[PDB]
Amino acid sequence: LSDLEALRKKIEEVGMPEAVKTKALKELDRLERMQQGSPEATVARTYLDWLTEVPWSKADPEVLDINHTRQVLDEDHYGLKDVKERILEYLAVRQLTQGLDVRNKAPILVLVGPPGVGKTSLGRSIARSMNRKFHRISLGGVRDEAEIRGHRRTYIGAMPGKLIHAMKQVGVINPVILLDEIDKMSSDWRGDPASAMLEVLDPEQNNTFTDHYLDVPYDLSKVFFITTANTLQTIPRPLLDRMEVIEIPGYTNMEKQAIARQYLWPKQVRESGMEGRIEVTDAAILRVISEYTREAGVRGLERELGKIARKGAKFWLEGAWEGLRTIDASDIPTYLGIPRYRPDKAETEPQVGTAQGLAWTPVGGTLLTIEVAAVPGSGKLSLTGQLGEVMKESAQAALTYLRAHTQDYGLPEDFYNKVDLHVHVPDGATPKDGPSAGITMATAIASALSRRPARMDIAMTGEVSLRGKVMPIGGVKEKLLAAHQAGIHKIVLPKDNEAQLEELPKEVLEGLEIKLVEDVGEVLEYLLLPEP
Amino acid sequence: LSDLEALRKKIEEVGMPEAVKTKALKELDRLERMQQGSPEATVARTYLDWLTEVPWSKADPEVLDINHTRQVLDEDHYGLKDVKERILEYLAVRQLTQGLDVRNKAPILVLVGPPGVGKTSLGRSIARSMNRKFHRISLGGVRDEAEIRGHRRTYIGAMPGKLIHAMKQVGVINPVILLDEIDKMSSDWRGDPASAMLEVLDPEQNNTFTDHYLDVPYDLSKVFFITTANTLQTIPRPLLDRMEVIEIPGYTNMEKQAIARQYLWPKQVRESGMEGRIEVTDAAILRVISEYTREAGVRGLERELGKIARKGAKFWLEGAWEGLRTIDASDIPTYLGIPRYRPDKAETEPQVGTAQGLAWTPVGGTLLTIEVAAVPGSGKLSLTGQLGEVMKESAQAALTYLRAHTQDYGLPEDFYNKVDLHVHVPDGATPKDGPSAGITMATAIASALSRRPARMDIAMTGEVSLRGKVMPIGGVKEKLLAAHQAGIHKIVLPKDNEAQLEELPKEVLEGLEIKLVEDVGEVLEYLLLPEP
Amino acid sequence: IPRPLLDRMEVIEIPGYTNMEKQAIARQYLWPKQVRESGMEGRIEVTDAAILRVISEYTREAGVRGLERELGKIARKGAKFWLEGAWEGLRTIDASDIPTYLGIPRYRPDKAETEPQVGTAQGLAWTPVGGTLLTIEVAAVPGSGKLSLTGQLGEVMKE
Numbered sequence A, B: 001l002s003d004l005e006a007l008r009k010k011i012e013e014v015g016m017p018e019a020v021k022t023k024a025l026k027e028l029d030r031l032e033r034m035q036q037g038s039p040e041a042t043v044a045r046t047y048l049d050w051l052t053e054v055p056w057s058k059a060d061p062e063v064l065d066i067n068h069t070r071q072v073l074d075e076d077h078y079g080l081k082d083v084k085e086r087i088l089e090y091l092a093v094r095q096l097t098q099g100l101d102v103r104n105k106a107p108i109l110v111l112v113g114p115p116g117v118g119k120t121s122l123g124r125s126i127a128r129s130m131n132r133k134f135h136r137i138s139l140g141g142v143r144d145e146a147e148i149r150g151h152r153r154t155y156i157g158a159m160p161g162k163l164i165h166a167m168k169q170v171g172v173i174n175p176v177i178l179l180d181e182i183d184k185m186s187s188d189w190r191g192d193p194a195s196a197m198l199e200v201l202d203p204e205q206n207n208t209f210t211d212h213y214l215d216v217p218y219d220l221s222k223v224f225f226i227t228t229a230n231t232l233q234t235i236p237r238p239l240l241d242r243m244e245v246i247e248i249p250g251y252t253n254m255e256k257q258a259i260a261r262q263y264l265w266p267k268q269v270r271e272s273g274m275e276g277r278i279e280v281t282d283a284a285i286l287r288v289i290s291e292y293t294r295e296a297g298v299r300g301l302e303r304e305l306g307k308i309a310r311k312g313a314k315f316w317l318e319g320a321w322e323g324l325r326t327i328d329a330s331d332i333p334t335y336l337g338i339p340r341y342r343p344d345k346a347e348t349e350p351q352v353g354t355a356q357g358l359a360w361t362p363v364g365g366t367l368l369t370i371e372v373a374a375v376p377g378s379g380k381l382s383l384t385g386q387l388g389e390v391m392k393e394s395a396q397a398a399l400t401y402l403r404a405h406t407q408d409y410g411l412p413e414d415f416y417n418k419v420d421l422h423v424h425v426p427d428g429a430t431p432k433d434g435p436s437a438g439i440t441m442a443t444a445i446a447s448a449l450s451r452r453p454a455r456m457d458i459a460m461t462g463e464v465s466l467r468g469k470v471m472p473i474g475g476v477k478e479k480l481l482a483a484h485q486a487g488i489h490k491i492v493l494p495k496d497n498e499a500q501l502e503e504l505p506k507e508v509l510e511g512l513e514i515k516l517v518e519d520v521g522e523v524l525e526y527l528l529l530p531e532p
Numbered sequence C: 001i002p003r004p005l006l007d008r009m010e011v012i013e014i015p016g017y018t019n020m021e022k023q024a025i026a027r028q029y030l031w032p033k034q035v036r037e038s039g040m041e042g043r044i045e046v047t048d049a050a051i052l053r054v055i056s057e058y059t060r061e062a063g064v065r066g067l068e069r070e071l072g073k074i075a076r077k078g079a080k081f082w083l084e085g086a087w088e089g090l091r092t093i094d095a096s097d098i099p100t101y102l103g104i105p106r107y108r109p110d111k112a113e114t115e116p117q118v119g120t121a122q123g124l125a126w127t128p129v130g131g132t133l134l135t136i137e138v139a140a141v142p143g144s145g146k147l148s149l150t151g152q153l154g155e156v157m158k159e
Ligand SMILES: Nc1ncnc2c1ncn2[C@@H]1O[C@H](COP(=O)(O)OP(=O)(O)O)[C@@H](O)[C@H]1O
Pocket: A076, A077, A078, A079, A080, A115, A116, A117, A118, A119, A120, A121, A122, A259, A263, A264, A297, A298, A299, A302
């Protein structure tokens, strides 16, 4: 109203395109009118201000040193040392990540892994090395283009989408932006946000992306995007373009202990301001890993170590008497209350029909159990979790296997006409291709129908054939890592997954007991205590 | 005239950062426009006033010892059992982290608890401990970021958000800002104010928190924020980093009586100007708490004892009869009318099919009167109460268990496909969204389909799994507090939680009589009044 | 009422009056008030039957506001029928000549004459504009079995 004349000068002082200037002129002749009593004038001035608020004509340094990135991803993060090779061979070779634009294979370098892993920390580290401003943005709960693109501006209360809004929070026009929680954009509310990402997906088409608040193709030419794929089950098929998948698996107990001892506990002590007045034994950290965090990464362990540090700080505020205290495993419960988990599952006191499996979850590899009961009925079958049909088909295959071998393991002669079965699975959706732990359900059905107990110390995963074969499956290494974190030793694995076994770290191949199998009956006889 | 000179003197006396001072002086130089017309020299005057009365570089003495906070929590507060420690821990952390290491650190004590139980009193005592100012900010009905951030400062009719008002009323820049009821926000009208909370509420972004009525972002790098929500299942996920919860559970009736005698009833006596003129016997106090209030926390006691004080004021003021009155449990209805709630739950004459379990509702822990109609039909379980399939899944698991124990409880030989079931659960989707009261619905179904009275005054809480084992349930404190709210002495708890149970304070222990269980076959032994 | 304005509030509930209380308040203060309001000073007599007729046939709002309006109408028609001549020293209005001074009775005397209907029930509620019935009605069509709320009420009524 009063500064508009100055606003008239403020437009072209900072470099803006000329179509933007044309639409600003179209929205500019509408001035010289009262604002109050006219919300259209208010939203018009909001648009005029936004024409300047959005970033224009800035830059970031072009440093892409191979050795700098190597050191930044090496010394800061004691973990990795293997995926760092992959990101090196990708980026150091990749002069087409940005700066150079061609119509060829330029993948957006998706990051896949459980929430606990430091893929986001990898984003922080690579952004620090590249010296391009970092900003994540949440995408879960977003299913609308109007929630990602601008809100159509016709009345007061219109704002651009969180993409442009986030790019306003930074002071550059060529950033590297992590897209946190990019797993839940479903085309069910006002179009497909996947299409908005698709125009963004290309390194040159995003330069033509037009908002809805603003109506000009915005400049996305030298902007890199990296996406956090927390889910390891399914990917958006339209987003298949320009993919080279980068996956972060689970962590070994050795690696978790080392990372806790070297670059997480020191910073946790630092956040409390201590100079090292608290020390923790290695066995204490082992107990914290085992009996306090049943996760796939170090996210929960960070919180637990913070709890320990805060308890130590409060105890030290009771008086100045500590040159240094070492917190061994003896007094751990005095800082974290009751131990929240078992040291291992050797005290399970084997159940009857219950089995244990390795399921595919958005938190990556995870140990889970499957429960089945033989209730009288008409041989019907019930499931849990509104399951994907992959596990339903696995259950049907298990039933077919157990119908032809009723007399091989003392199963009832007709259990498909007189006894119904209720089956529970903690993870129901299973967008992962095929049943992740179908053989676990097969074992559970066999144990439940056998009217015999079943050992609970042994995890397994894979699929069953209609002929009783133990099918191969991907991600076996992650499930082995998850079982190792819980300490489950005897792991049953398909004979077809020897390739997955070779790449396992030597910290895994020693403390477990692998069991290569190709028939369901073998797995049945290696867990069921009595055969008849 | 002299008004501009006075404003110049005021802006000279008041200090602020250099950019703010320079731009305020420039907009002061931008005066002399039409005062008695459209806002061009008046909104500028309002801007200058806003910049002059919002405080800059004004603070309070801070905490330098946990001993003073120890005393302020011991006296003028009943102690609050396990929450004696957590606040002291956090304050120790804050005291030790005063060497300017709070940025991107120092979480803010989200205080989850029912409105009745002392939360704002905790904040008031804490503020008194450090000698800080106090000011609440109600955010239970906020839907606009402009109610938090400002608004475009170009016209008259738009004021800054609640935060700027609260900073203005407080004479210093680092008060104890208590954000009321933050969880119950919504995003229905324009925008989403969740990002406003994210920016204001995190250090290293509070100084980055932007204002809109004042174009200059204001710095909250010193405010000891504290936030009291009621539900952890509704706060936005981004508002969980640096958000450590200090949970405040309900109260036992013994604690209610002990605090009524000390802080509540004497406050009412001082309120109605009846100092040392009327007494109340502890029998009357326990009658009041057990018959007139059925809420977690002691806010109801405030109203009830205020009513008693007012009635005493009227009865005295129509003529004194002695110097110190008295009252017992036999004449409470003379002062509060009909006792709304039964003094004891042993006189409930157990009903036919309905069971009653425990739940931690956000308003306060209470009992779900889970009702079951075993209407004859074709066999189906329709579950009302605005609930997801998690309640339906717990229902199906319990139904499976009873199907495994048909003849063990007089149940029909087949009832999954013979009698339809209606299961009304009054909003079981409360915090801990999902089945945390599966055994309650299990015994409800057992009573309903066995035509045997589900014993009342035994309020249970637990989980039923497909096999039948009663697995542990999180939060074995809120459940017991809700158990003792309704004056229930008999409680059924999973055995796997007894290790947690031993950690509970003696106030919740002695007043309750726990009969630990590990199966459903033993739960149906307690609450079935007859043997069959 | 706003929650910020609900603290430090003590509620003093004043629901509507009762029919005999309505007669009593009309006889004690309302009727003399309106009689001196119009300009009449004691030459009109009104029987209690006429008062009850006014109350139960021309007012359904809780209280006396509608009664105030109806009694003002009575006073103004009395201004008619005394202004053109003092025919009588104290004119008496019974239940018979109440529509000569007012409109047609717009409400029934008693609800007992409702002649019970096949498929309707008479509810109760306190709508914050005044108490009222909830004449909830339902229907039974031969179909396949399904419930349909109608009236834009909450799902609790469907429950
Ligand atoms: N592979 C890894 N190597 C080193 N550190 C890791 C690794 N994975 C996780 N971390 C640690 O986990 C912590 C949390 O990182 P991050 O997940 O990026 O933060 P946020 O949880 O806020 O996204 C970091 O401090 C990082 O040191």
